[PDB]
Structures are given as structure tokens and as C-alpha cells.
Design an enzyme around this catalytic site. Structure first.
Site, PDB file in Angstrom:
ATOM      1  N   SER A  25      37.288  37.791  47.123  1.00 27.40           N
ATOM      2  CA  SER A  25      36.066  38.243  47.573  1.00 27.40           C
ATOM      3  C   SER A  25      35.781  39.495  46.736  1.00 27.40           C
ATOM      4  O   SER A  25      36.719  39.920  45.937  1.00 27.40           O
ATOM      5  CB  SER A  25      35.899  38.175  48.861  1.00 27.40           C
ATOM      6  N   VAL A  31      34.887  33.628  46.705  1.00 24.42           N
ATOM      7  CA  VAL A  31      35.649  32.268  46.071  1.00 24.42           C
ATOM      8  C   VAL A  31      36.605  31.589  46.857  1.00 24.42           C
ATOM      9  O   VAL A  31      37.473  32.184  47.750  1.00 24.42           O
ATOM     10  CB  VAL A  31      36.498  32.672  44.841  1.00 24.42           C
ATOM     11  N   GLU A  99      46.576  37.367  36.219  1.00 26.63           N
ATOM     12  CA  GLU A  99      46.879  38.536  37.097  1.00 26.63           C
ATOM     13  C   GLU A  99      47.708  38.121  38.398  1.00 26.63           C
ATOM     14  O   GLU A  99      48.740  38.899  38.475  1.00 26.63           O
ATOM     15  CB  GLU A  99      45.518  39.169  37.407  1.00 26.63           C
ATOM     16  N   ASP A 100      47.384  37.298  39.012  1.00 31.36           N
ATOM     17  CA  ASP A 100      48.032  36.610  40.217  1.00 31.36           C
ATOM     18  C   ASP A 100      49.617  36.148  39.774  1.00 31.36           C
ATOM     19  O   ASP A 100      50.410  36.474  40.860  1.00 31.36           O
ATOM     20  CB  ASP A 100      47.096  35.537  40.920  1.00 31.36           C
ATOM     21  N   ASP A 139      33.735  40.436  29.916  1.00 27.93           N
ATOM     22  CA  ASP A 139      34.665  40.730  30.988  1.00 27.93           C
ATOM     23  C   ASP A 139      35.703  39.766  30.881  1.00 27.93           C
ATOM     24  O   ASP A 139      36.381  39.574  31.925  1.00 27.93           O
ATOM     25  CB  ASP A 139      33.747  40.275  32.209  1.00 27.93           C
ATOM     26  N   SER A 142      42.753  39.806  32.935  1.00 26.68           N
ATOM     27  CA  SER A 142      43.883  38.856  33.188  1.00 26.68           C
ATOM     28  C   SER A 142      43.612  38.139  34.393  1.00 26.68           C
ATOM     29  O   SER A 142      43.843  36.992  34.579  1.00 26.68           O
ATOM     30  CB  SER A 142      45.266  39.958  33.541  1.00 26.68           C
TER      31      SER A 142
END
Ligand SMILES: Nc1ncnc2c1ncn2[C@@H]1O[C@H](COP(=O)(O)OP(=O)(O)NP(=O)(O)O)[C@@H](O)[C@H]1O
Ligand SMILES: [Mn+2]
Ligand SMILES: [Mn+2]
Length: 285
Positions: A25, A31, A99-100, A139, A142
Site C-alpha cells: 500500500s 495491492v 527489492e523484497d 519509474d 527494484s
């Protein structure tokens, strides 16, 4: 084909947009992890601030990613436009954003990391060269590189994307878009965006794959690397990547030269994503 989904379907698929389905969010919108009534595993983006910064972001995705399909782009399966509600349905990428995975998780060896680099680059090249009109992402992050079941990179988030004619070199816009740590320097000096801008943002992501650190660290990343580039380049790479093989650093450095070229302050000096692809090809050959 794209599919117009009833608002009620999305409502019950997420258990009334319950918090348990929420997997992201803030910023653009929420999402949710969901499973459609047909059994499709999907992610649903509920856009906020509609009729403004929400309807523009909605249209941007419909006009770009919503109209194209590629192996290295997130597929937009469906959409929903009712009243002031705007939702977007993508196929669920099992391992979430890069990224996660890069921070907090699973293991990424270099062989898979370079495939992530090649794939994401191939996705961008498709946007810049194989698409007429050209698509500028604006935009590249990662967090906007998703990883599917095979740990294949799939470029996501076309909320701030724009269409540029193939006969042009840049696009003059209304606002400054991007994420701090990824913004091309010339994007600050003018209200103009370009595919070369995307190349820069790609460079940062490639650095994240090489170093393992966030772009914000550490006084930033792009600057610190450029300085250590004149010092000891061996003390810059990812520690866990060197444990795999020490004689592979020659390939790592070549990949680094690709990342550095992308990160040049001059947009004209940056390579195209096609060149980046071509460099990757000549590296492992
Ligand atoms: N299809 C998907 N599969 C799995 N995870 C996803 C998917 N889409 C989004 N996510 C996750 O949700 C996060 C937010 O998605 P995203 O589409 O980037 O929202 P956003 O708000 O537009 N990005 P930003 O505004 O720049 O912070 C991502 O970083 C992922 O972790
Ligand atoms: Mn995002
Ligand atoms: Mn966005």
C-alpha cells in the site's frame, strides 16, 4: 485478451479488500493478493486519488502495458472502472518484487541475478525499440521488477509511463516523476523525459544486483561507486556473490562497466537498452 472484470468479483476475491489480502500500500494505491473465481492467481491494484493522480496513473497503464504482452513484462490480465473506483489485475508473481527478495527471503546466486538483469533489460528494450510509439517507463525501480515462479524478471508498474513518438528524442511533460535514488540528474533540470532516462534508472537497479545495497546508502550509492571506481573496485561488489566464485569477478567487472555507462550524467553518452543487451551477449561469449 484483456478482460473487463466486475467490481463485485474483485470485492469477494479479496474478502472485501480485507487486510489479510493486502501485500502493498501507500503512494499509488493498495495491492492485494487474490484468487479469481476461475482460479487465476492474481494481484489487484486499487488506485486511490481517482479523477486526478489516480485516473492518470490508470490511463497510463491501460495505454501502455495494457496493450502489450512480453515475456519480461508483467501481464495486465484485467481492469475495473466503476464510479471513482479504479482497479487493475495482474498475474501474481510468486516471489514479489526484486527489492523484497534482495532485502528480507530467498537466495539469488549470480547466474540467476544476471538472468534477472538480462530479462529486465530485455523488457525495457522492448518498450524503447520494439514498440511504436515508444514507451518511457519513468519509474524503473527494484520494487518495480517482479520475479515469477522461475525467478525471471518482469518489469512492473506503468503507472507513470508515457507514450513517445519514434521520431522524437525526448518528451516534455507536466510533472517530475520518479523515485529518489533512481531519478536521472537531467530530470531535475527540465520537465523532459526520455528512454535514456529509463536507462539511467536501469543502471541503478543493475547496481543493486551487483552491490546488494539500497540506492540511498551511503554518505548516495551511484556517487560512492563512482568514487570507489578510482580506488579498489574489489571492495564494492556483493560479499555473498564472491563466495560463489572468485574467478568470476572478471565477468562482474564487465557487468559493472555496463552499469556505469548507464549511470553517466550525460544522457547522450548512455547506451540504449539494445546496446546493453548486446553487451551482455558479448560478455558471456
Ligand atoms: N503482480 C504482482 N505480484 C506480486 N507482487 C506484486 C505484484 N504487483 C505488485 N506487487 C507488490 O506490490 C508492491 C507495490 O506494487 P506497485 O505496482 O509498484 O505499486 P506502486 O504504488 O504503484 N509503486 P510506487 O508508487 O512507486 O511505490 C510491489 O513492490 C510488490 O511487492
Ligand atoms: Mn511500485
Ligand atoms: Mn506507481
Amino acid at each position: 485478451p484483456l478482460r473487463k472484470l466486475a467490481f463485485a468479483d474483485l470485492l469477494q476475491a479479496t474478502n472485501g479488500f480485507h487486510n489479510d489480502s493486502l501485500i502493498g500500500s501507500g503512494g499509488f494505491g493498495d495491492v492485494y493478493k487474490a484468487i479469481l473465481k476461475d482460479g487465476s492467481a492474481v494481484a489487484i491494484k486499487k488506485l486511490i486519488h481517482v479523477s486526478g493522480q489516480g485516473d492518470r496513473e490508470f490511463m497510463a497503464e491501460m495505454e501502455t502495458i495494457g496493450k502489450i504482452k512480453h515475456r519480461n513484462l508483467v501481464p495486465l490480465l484485467g481492469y475495473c472502472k466503476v464510479g471513482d473506483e479504479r482497479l487493475l489485475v495482474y498475474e501474481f508473481m510468486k516471489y514479489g518484487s526484486l527489492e523484497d527478495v534482495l532485502h528480507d527471503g530467498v537466495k539469488l546466486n549470480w547466474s540467476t541475478r544476471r538472468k534477472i538483469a538480462i530479462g529486465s533489460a530485455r523488457g525495457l528494450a522492448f518498450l524503447h525499440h520494439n514498440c511504436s510509439p515508444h514507451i518511457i517507463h519513468r519509474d524503473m525501480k527494484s520494487s518495480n521488477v517482479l520475479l515469477d515462479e522461475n525467478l525471471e524478471a518482469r518489469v512492473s508498474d506503468f503507472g507513470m509511463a508515457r507514450l513517445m513518438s519514434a521520431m522524437d528524442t525526448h518528451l516534455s511533460v507536466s510533472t517530475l516523476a520518479g523515485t529518489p535514488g533512481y531519478v536521472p540528474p537531467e530530470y531535475y533540470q527540465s520537465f523532459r523525459c526520455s528512454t535514456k532516462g529509463d536507462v539511467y534508472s536501469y543502471g541503478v537497479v543493475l547496481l543493486e544486483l551487483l552491490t546488494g545495497k539500497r540506492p540511498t546508502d551511503s554518505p548516495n550509492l551511484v556517487g560512492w561507486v563512482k568514487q570507489h571506481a578510482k580506488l579498489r573496485i574489489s571492495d564494492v561488489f556483493d560479499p555473498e556473490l564472491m563466495k560463489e566464485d572468485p574467478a568470476l569477478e572478471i565477468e562482474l567487472l564487465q557487468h559493472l562497466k555496463v552499469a556505469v555507462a548507464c549511470l553517466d550524467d550525460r544522457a547522450w553518452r548512455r547506451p540504449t537498452m539494445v546496446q546493453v543487451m548486446a553487451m551482455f551477449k558479448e560478455i558471456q561469449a
